[PDB]
């Protein structure tokens, strides 16, 4: 199978990698494993001015004050259990956010901070009938209200919540209070059920305490029952949030009608739905197993028709040491990372189910050594009913000697594995920065990208609205609007000249520069940097970008195009002249 | 030759890429072209906390307020015209800086704002007898003083300057005023001479006016004469800067002792010393030529033995449309980018010289089409007398259709070219983010990196010193020091436990957390992230890092390790508890 993409040739799949602790999203070509684009999300990017521009800061809201993020889980919007290629969503663990990327422009266009929670970790998407909800985990137990009066985790009102976000609006839709905590999550192929893993059912703060129970659980959610309760107006609110809050804890040994708790050993981690829709598969982590829950049996569990919640367990196969995550080939095989054994294990799901019933059978097909200590793994289209069993990426945490020494900080090793055959063949070691935990692959024909910006694009629609209030037509105009010590420069840009090449202001004036790239040629980006003022942004073809800064320094100050756009690029410059105070 | 590095195999060269206007430095393996490591410099890195930690902000001094940078020209220190692998230096055009990276730890350790200039662009290093000076071009003409009294570029005191920095101390060494401006620069193989290109001899501000005269110049500096005058006290200063400033402007048609101006067509760009040390070669940009200055002849120019400045020009080969940069194979051939023709032209230098002298020889050997619009190119070891003629990287600005569509903003195309034989051949297309401009390659055996940190490392020595004062032994202690409204947490970390797992502070306190990674095994890095507090940092084996922030939010606040360090990493957490107002 394939492997080398020589000059002129194109990759077959897009990869969307999390940037990890660095905070961005990265687009790669598969199987070349080359990075094609960096998508700034929670990081501040000097190149594009994400985190610096008015458009980007507006999307971020108040969280624009944070220079950091921590992502793990990129996921693509679906329709009928199939990628529709409209949206990618990703978590921020550091500052408790969920972000949307529009796959047509390859930019983050929505960002929300989840209210009344701490640490958005696990995140996956509703599959069916489509991605109406972004389900997202809040990992850490906190007091409610968190005012510094109560610190106890055991306190009745100390808990965390499972979060649902409207995918289209990017507003909270509801929250569910749970016992224990939440790690990872996934969703069924009907839209009625979602599940999440929990490693801290003990509600402990110390290391030994979190490991005390032999089993924790995966909590199952009846999303339909939840929605009906929100609709009937049976919910509460907390503090300053309008978000409907539902109670999915167990009261006095009896289930809330929103949730079921299926005990699972031990500090489980991964929570993955098989591509046939049959199973939620929890990776056992401290237990050398996966637990297979049958979605088939879930209606009966919620209709109180099953004696023990363990009855929905249909398979609990032994796999090896340190199972973290599971993916699928769409041929009936599951593939699990074993962190401690440092392997990917390939196993037949339906044979494990047989084994659980006592049938004598070898469900393990193969173990492949990886280098080293795999966390997540991802097989192409695994999260869809179209899982194609072609490629597998295993993202390993310790690269040791697999790449040249680069000092005491090492890269992660994301290894491309051929899975189209009976035998898994390691094909490529891919060094990556700042620990992408997980990734997702899409067919090339599943992604449709704008070649150039449309002038009515929502991304800078507010900046367009500001321009009309000024009677400024962005497509044509090159003017300076003055309003107190506010200065609003509006300009066209065209390789190799700025539409406005000089302007004068007073020391202390607040300057906003709005640039519209009127070039029609694809790939002709411009940039705008103001020297010694910490101002930098990108303006791609047919885009409008704006940036606000203070001219605290008197004198002549140069602004230049940062993007090489033309033979006379070095000369694409202008002058801001600041009068003394 | 080569091309493919498979699993378990290692690259043959280190590549060091400028991150462009993204702001960082990137480490690659050649010939795989894979990104092994990112070294944050002018960017804020959320992963390692560069820009957030006290160690980094201290290195950045006052400029730590800037979140942006624009880097172009990475260069490795040399000893007797050969790489010595101690430091890499890089410019920042956007905020007028020069950074130093220690190649043993792959971190930026020193950073200077260059006084009284605007935009540090061109940069190269003294070659022989070693890298004593870092030379850097300030590109834009500004008034002196720059206080908003004069804006006219034609004024007696409106000018830019050439800069010399002591490579070891990272202090200013001297500055030389020049006419016109400064684009790129290189140095000879003796230490006496340096050269720079100028494209704005007209001192205009508009596009047409910068293209006014058919020639500008390269300006040659006599570093020995400059050093002679500085120690003979003969220098001026500008404002509050101690930096010795010398005048290299032409007076009334008469030269200064420090410079000579050699007319060159037209808006010349790249300035490159050949590997035999015979030529400063300037790429012609608007002239379809390059210009060859015989370094041989510079002593007679400066001594007044030569009739006219053009006498040091021993070659002006016609090469094609829009020459930008030149590199060398160490076989007598030069390789020049043609931005307009989109080609690398390979040519024989000695033959070009003989063709300027009259002889009719075809000095052009080959033209290779590149994709598309190349800027810089770099041949392996080209800046040393060991130029090995094996690899060539042409860094092109328009990727067009060469990679998968990823939206309106396109990657750059950095193309690996095999030049070890007689014919240049294109072997690999490497997509890169944010316009890397230039890059430098080094033999594997030229770089030596630390596997773990030394406890006594200068990088965090100030933090060690501060620890003494509080009475703290960093290798062992887990303490909290109260000092008014300032709390100073010291802790060791050892997978998978923080040394301090909870602390309590009062609303409003200034909390400094200092972490020392006492793990002994390589690659066992830890992280530190305070949830919803914009706090994030790396701590690698044997390192001490510190971050300061304001606990302004009452309640329970989780901190967690961001770097996957152990099987129980998810559980490597801690609590900050904040006592109400
Ligand atoms: Cu616009 Cu370079
Ligand atoms: Cu320490 Cu993860
Ligand atoms: Ca547990
Ligand atoms: Ca000129
Ligand atoms: Cl998962
Ligand atoms: Cl150059
Ligand atoms: K690591
Ligand atoms: K480009």
UniProtKB/Swiss-Prot annotation, chains A, B:
Residues 485-581 are annotated as: COX2-like. The lineage of its organism: Bacteria, Pseudomonadati, Pseudomonadota, Gammaproteobacteria, Pseudomonadales. This is Nitrous-oxide reductase. Cu cation A1 binds at residues 526, 561, 565, 572. Cu cation A2 binds at residues 561, 563, 565, 569. Keywords: Calcium, Copper, Metal-binding, Oxidoreductase, Periplasm, Signal. PROSITE patterns: COX2 (PS00078), COX2_CUA (PS50857), TAT (PS51318). Homodimer. One of its GO terms (biological process) is copper ion import. Ca(2+) 1 binds at residues 397, 412. One of its GO terms (molecular function) is cytochrome-c oxidase activity. Binds 2 calcium ions per subunit.
């Amino acid at each position: 199978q394939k492997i080398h993409v020589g000059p002129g040739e194109l990759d077959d799949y897009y990869g969307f990698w999390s940037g990890g602790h660095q905070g961005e999203v990265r687009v790669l070509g598969v199987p070349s494993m080359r990075e094609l684009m960096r998508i700034p999300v929670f990081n501040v990017d000097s190149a594009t001015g994400w985190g610096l521009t008015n458009e980007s800061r507006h999307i971020m809201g108040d969280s624009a004050k944070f220079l950091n993020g921590d992502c793990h889980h990129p996921h693509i919007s679906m329709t009928d259990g199939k990628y529709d290629g409209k949206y990618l969503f990703i978590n921020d663990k550091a500052n408790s956010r969920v972000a949307r990327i529009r796959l047509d422009i390859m930019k983050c266009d929505k960002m929300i901070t989840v209210p009344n929670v701490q640490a958005i970790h696990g995140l996956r998407l509703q599959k069916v009938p489509h991605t109406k909800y972004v389900f997202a985990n809040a990992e850490f137990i906190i007091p409610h209200p968190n005012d510094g009066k109560v610190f106890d985790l055991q306190d009745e009102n100390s808990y965390t919540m499972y979060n649902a976000i409207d995918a289209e609006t990017m507003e909270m839709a509801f929250q569910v209070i749970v016992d224990g905590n939440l790690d990872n999550t996934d969703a069924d192929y009907t839209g009625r059920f979602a599940a999440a893993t929990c490693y801290n059912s003990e509600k402990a703060f110390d290391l030994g305490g979190m490991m005390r129970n032999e089993r924790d659980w995966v909590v199952v959610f009846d999303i339909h029952a939840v929605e009906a309760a929100v609709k009937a107006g049976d919910f509460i609110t907390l503090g300053d949030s309008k978000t409907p809050v539902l109670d999915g804890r167990k009261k006095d040994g009896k289930d809330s009608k929103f949730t079921r708790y299926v005990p699972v050993p031990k500090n489980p981690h991964g929570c993955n739905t098989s591509s046939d829709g049959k199973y939620f598969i929890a990776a056992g982590k401290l237990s050398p197993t996966c637990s297979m829950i049958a979605i088939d049996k879930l209606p009966d569990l919620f209709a109180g028709k099953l004696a023990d919640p363990r009855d929905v367990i249909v398979g609990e196969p032994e796999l090896g040491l340190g199972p973290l995550h599971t993916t699928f080939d769409g041929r009936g095989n599951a593939y699990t990372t074993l962190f401690i054994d440092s392997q990917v294990v390939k196993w037949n799901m339906e044979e494990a189910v047989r084994a659980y019933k006592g049938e004598k059978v070898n469900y393990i097909k193969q173990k492949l050594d990886v280098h080293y200590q795999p966390g997540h793994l991802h097989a192409s289209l695994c999260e869809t009913n179209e899982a194609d069993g072609k490629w597998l990426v295993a993202l390993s945490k310790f690269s040791k000697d697999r790449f040249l020494p680069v000092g005491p900080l090492h890269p992660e090793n994301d290894q491309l594995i051929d899975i189209s055959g009976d035998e898994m063949k390691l094909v490529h070691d891919g060094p990556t920065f700042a620990e992408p935990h997980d990734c997702i692959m899409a067919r090339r024909d599943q992604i449709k990208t704008k070649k150039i910006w449309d002038r009515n694009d929502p991304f800078f629609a507010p900046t367009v609205e500001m321009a009309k209030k000024d009677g400024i037509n962005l497509d044509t105009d090159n003017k300076v609007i003055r309003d107190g010590n506010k200065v609003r420069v509006y300009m066209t840009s065209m390789a190799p000249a700025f539409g406005v090449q000089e302007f004068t202001v007073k020391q202390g004036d607040e300057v906003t520069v709005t640039i519209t790239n009127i070039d029609q040629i694809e790939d002709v980006s411009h940039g705008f940097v103001v020297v010694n003022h910490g101002v930098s942004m990108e303006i791609s073809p047919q885009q409008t970008s704006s940036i606000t800064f203070v001219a605290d320094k008197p004198g002549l100050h140069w602004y230049y195009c940062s993007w090489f756009c033309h033979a006379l690029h070095m000369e694409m410059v202008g002058r801001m002249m600041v009068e003394p105070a």
